[PDB]
């Protein structure tokens, strides 16, 4: 038979050629591909297709590869797969398939591995967007409660450091030394997010670095506050290459031991992650932004400058002046010209990642929000990216998504296990209502279980009655919370028995592929142009073109959606 699109959509959601508005933004995504045929559509319910002997197989044991979970008729927004409509399948807390789910007994075209059976539960994705969960590379471990704010914006992995609210943690992403590391590994067992910890890089010999490596860190953080010296850099990077771990940097803002060019030379063409690349959050003043030209630099921005708004200068000024309990350090630190420039460079694919800088100038619960907010402000000011397709904003959206998903993963050497909706990966997933995209998710799926969700009255006759607020779920409960969460570590540590030694019940996974990567390995954000900054007026030129845009008055996904 023949059915109208409108009727089809109502049953099954949007198909190839259909367009979806991402909130109250002016971004419109379009479905590129529909992997789940027509006429044999898998839906859970009374009188529906995923019933016994019909869409569901009723004779196969689980060891035949029957699924543990299926997400049906869902729109996948992923930086590597693009914008597709598919069934998604989970087995052993891993993504087994993307395609057409059902029962091959009674159905043509069931994707191998997507057999629904006796073992299978179901999620109805018809009117939903599925993303990879975000990854926040710049976490200060000041407060355990950050995790909750994060899960509530669709972030489920933390990279950083600290030891609670010490003055060192308030300023840097460091967990210093083997005692403190051990302690912190043990603590995070109580958190419903994945974690990897960073160590203190400012050391003269190998000894003090190696120490922390074996103790379990995934990285070394080089910070001004503890000394952002050439020495620090050099030894940190040399060790890193030895240990297959990452190095992150917060450069010398004062220009004490050098200018940016000297820092660059301290990198010695070695892979490095550069936090708040613009400089409002720290770095060689006015011109740390020039590191975004280099192939060995994996650049990030912290989220308080994105998007650039009318209140942005006022805020930042006042913030530093309290951050550093303080004026010529101030107005040199806080530069309208470079902030605008950061925005543009993002849109170009020259700054490759978003981050929070949690409770050290940024907002742990706003990375997915701000990303979307930025994409939309930038469409307005610049129009369509050249690579956009005329009818849709896919190219753009997808650039931005890479920023909080696959790119962070790649940077910290965990793209083998997390960061994209792809076969063989850990199911660290987020479900969104389009109406709420970026802002307010439906749920978080954390190791194949729902860990976090928007839930109303537990006494009510439905799950939807008011008050609806974010709450832990069963994956967040008991021994499952550890079972479903990863503690990232060094291979050195893994090999030394960190899991036993530290007594960790978390999944313990070795970071890998941190040192052979470059800017060009980054997804949709692989551009290395010439960047020039004017030491007087702080004006930024990118391949000779002035890089600016005007501040926004009104943000999307903002006062409409939030009481906060």
């Amino acid at each position: 038979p023949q059915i109208s699109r409108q009727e089809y959509a109502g049953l099954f959601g949007p198909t190839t050629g259909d367009k979806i508005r991402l909130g109250d933004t002016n971004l419109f995504i379009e479905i590129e591909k529909d992997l789940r045929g027509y006429g044999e559509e898998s839906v859970y319910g009374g009188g529906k297709s995923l019933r016994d002997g019909m869409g569901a197989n009723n004779h196969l044991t689980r060891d035949n590869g029957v699924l543990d979970l299926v997400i049906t008729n869902v729109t996948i927004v992923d930086a590597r797969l693009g914008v597709i409509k598919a069934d998604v399948g989970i087995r052993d807390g891993k993504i087994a398939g993307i395609g057409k789910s059902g029962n091959p007994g009674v159905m043509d075209g069931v994707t191998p591995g997507l057999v629904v059976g006796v073992s299978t539960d179901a999620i109805s994705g018809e009117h939903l967007i599925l993303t990879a969960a975000g990854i926040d590379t710049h976490i200060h471990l000041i407060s355990p409660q950050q995790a909750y704010h994060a899960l509530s914006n669709g972030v489920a992995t933390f990279f950083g450091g600290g030891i609670g609210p010490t003055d060192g943690t308030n300023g840097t992403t460091v967990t210093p030394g083997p005692w403190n590391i051990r302690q912190m590994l043990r603590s995070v067992e109580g958190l419903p997010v994945n974690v990897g910890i960073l160590g203190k890089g400012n050391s003269y010999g190998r000894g003090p670095l190696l120490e922390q490596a074996i103790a379990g860190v995934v990285g070394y953080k080089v910070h001004e506050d503890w000394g952002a010296t050439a020495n620090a850099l050099r030894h940190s990077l040399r060790m890193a290459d030895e240990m297959d771990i990452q190095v992150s940097v917060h450069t010398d803002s004062l220009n004490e031991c050098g200018y940016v060019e000297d820092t660059i030379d301290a990198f010695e063409g070695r892979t490095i992650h550069t936090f708040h690349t613009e400089g409002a959050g720290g770095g060689h003043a006015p011109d740390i932004i020039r590191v975004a030209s280099q192939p060995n630099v994996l650049p990030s921005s912290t989220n308080p400058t994105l998007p650039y708004g009318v209140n942005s200068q006022a805020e930042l000024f006042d913030m530093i002046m309290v951050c550093h309990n303080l004026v010529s350090f101030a107005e040199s630190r806080v530069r309208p010209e470079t902030i605008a420039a950061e925005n543009v460079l993002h849109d170009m694919g020259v700054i490759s990642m978003f981050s929070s800088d949690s409770q050290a100038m940024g907002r742990v619960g706003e990375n997915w929000l701000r990303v979307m907010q930025t994409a939309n402000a930038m469409k307005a000011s610049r129009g369509k990216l050249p690579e956009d397709a005329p009818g849709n904003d896919n190219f753009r959206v997808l650039r931005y998504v890479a920023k909080i998903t696959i790119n962070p993963a790649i940077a910290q050497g965990v793209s083998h296990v997390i960061g994209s909706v792809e076969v063989g990966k850990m199911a660290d997933l987020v479900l969104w209502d389009p109406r709420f995209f970026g802002a307010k998710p439906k749920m978080v799926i954390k190791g194949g279980m729902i860990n976090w969700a928007a839930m109303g009255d537990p006494n009510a006759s439905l799950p939807t009655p008011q008050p609806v607020f974010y709450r832990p779920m069963f994956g967040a409960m008991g021994k499952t919370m550890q079972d479903t969460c990863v503690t990232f570590v060094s291979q050195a540590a893994l090999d030394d028995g960190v899991k036993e030694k530290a007594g960790l019940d978390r999944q313990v996974i070795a970071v890998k592929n941190c040192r052979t990567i470059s800017k060009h390995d980054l997804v949709r954000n692989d551009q290395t142009p010439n960047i020039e900054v004017d030491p007087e007026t702080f004006a930024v030129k990118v391949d000779g073109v002035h890089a600016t845009c005007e501040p926004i008055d009104t943000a999307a996904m903002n006062q409409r959606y939030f009481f906060g």
Partner: protein, 132 residues
């Protein structure tokens, strides 16, 4: 257009969706002989529907309703409706329902004879009380 779409809204294309196009269609006449409403879904094995439904049961062997996935047809008491039927896909292996088949429902290889397991099924329907 784009200027008119609500928050989270969809802009749908025009082209209708065509489903089940290849599949051969059998029309059967269905009367509900019970006192209570009967409703049947898209993927149910029509052959094995509620005993109280009276139709050409032999014709529904290996068949489902040629309607939209997830939808259903309602048969109110003492009413007659014609329904389109189509074969199941895949392996045409039907387990469970009312335990009438618990196997293969295909045609097999001989045009202008019936497989004996089909005739068995049909006989068994008859004496389990499944109205034809």
């Amino acid at each position: 257009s784009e200027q008119n779409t609500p928050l989270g809204g969809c802009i749908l294309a025009d082209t209708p969706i065509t489903f089940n196009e290849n599949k051969p269609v059998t029309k059967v006449k269905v009367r509900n002989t019970g006192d209570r409403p009967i409703q049947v879904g898209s993927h149910f094995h029509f052959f094995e529907v509620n005993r109280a439904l009276e139709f050409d049961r032999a014709a529904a062997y290996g068949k489902r309703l040629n309607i939209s996935s997830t939808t259903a047809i309602r048969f109110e008491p003492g009413d007659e409706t014609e329904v389109p039927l189509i074969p199941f896909g895949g392996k045409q292996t039907l387990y469970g329902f009312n335990n009438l088949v618990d196997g293969w429902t295909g045609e097999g290889v001989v045009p202008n004879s019936e497989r004996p397991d089909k005739l068995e099924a049909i006989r068994r329907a008859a004496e389990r009380g499944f109205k034809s």
